[PDB]
Amino acid sequence: VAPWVPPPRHDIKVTMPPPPGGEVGGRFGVSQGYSDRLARTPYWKRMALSTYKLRMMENATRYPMSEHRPGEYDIRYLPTPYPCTIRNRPLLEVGEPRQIPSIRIPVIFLVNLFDEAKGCWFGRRYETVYVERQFMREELMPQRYAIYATPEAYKLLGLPVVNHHTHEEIPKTPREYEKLLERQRYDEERWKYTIEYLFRKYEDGPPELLDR
Amino acid sequence: FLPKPPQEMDVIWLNERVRERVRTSRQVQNVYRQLKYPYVKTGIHYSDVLDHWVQVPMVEAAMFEVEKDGGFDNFILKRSGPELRSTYGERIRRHILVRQKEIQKNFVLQKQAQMLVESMEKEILPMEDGKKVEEVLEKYGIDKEQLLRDIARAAVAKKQQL
């Protein structure tokens, strides 16, 4: 028995009903939201409380996307009230063999770390370096020598914010990982893809024509 | 499906679910099906808030999402109750929230101490005599013995570092 029945999770609207419970909460299976308060409230009273501008504002619905879950189709329009699985599909397909290379992730170094074995520097303070996932999660992070590169992390550190799309689309093959690396290189050195840079080696004329 | 219902699945399965794959025989007459499960890797991560390593069963997708979020604590906080179907997840979430509140309290304590030290430094910036120094010390409610001990400790640390 429930002495107190919780109300609908998101019922801020004064005239329109709450969205389907699965959109805001964590239980799917229904495409139409309902609110006993709104249903019982007389139509004249709801119209009195609301105003034409407010009525239109609360009527405006984002279609086909969802208002609460950005970048996902709302469940009330899908063939079934459960969320679309195309975006949140499992990492590995049923028949896909696991062939994922040793991906590298961006890490901001909080202190100048000197590799004594190699006689070099892993990275300078407040600098971003692409390192091994296992290395980062096993040695750098626990030692507090570096942290993952996130826009929020950059904001906290005060450095210029860069949205490294880390694991935005996990590669599933070495070729896909190479494509991801190429896209990252492009996004980083966009200036290297200009026509002038592409023809830099032909800045003035053919080397053979050029005198010695 | 999942091995256990959402309120009982102790392991962290973000979106991986048990799926049956179907394969026809050499002759297309008959078919055999077999269930397949995700690769469960024990994620031994380190949480800055807790300052101590925490290990929990996870999946490769979970590890990748943790790396995306830039921290185990951030991943747990981003994932909501229904979205994170792990009792272990809820326990670590509560521990992380308590530890975060402790971090905030410690920062407030440090700020209060900084304000107090600044005020007393303004009060006693000149050096006049031990009598007036003790008067200000008792005005601000401080023990000379522990003041001297911490001064000596700071001097020892300074000498050691340089």
Partner: peptide
């Protein structure tokens, strides 16, 4: 400045 090898520190307590 700081120095560290590739296996000096282990996350777990060995």
């Amino acid at each position: 400045a700081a120095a560290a090898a590739a296996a000096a520190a282990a996350a777990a307590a060995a």
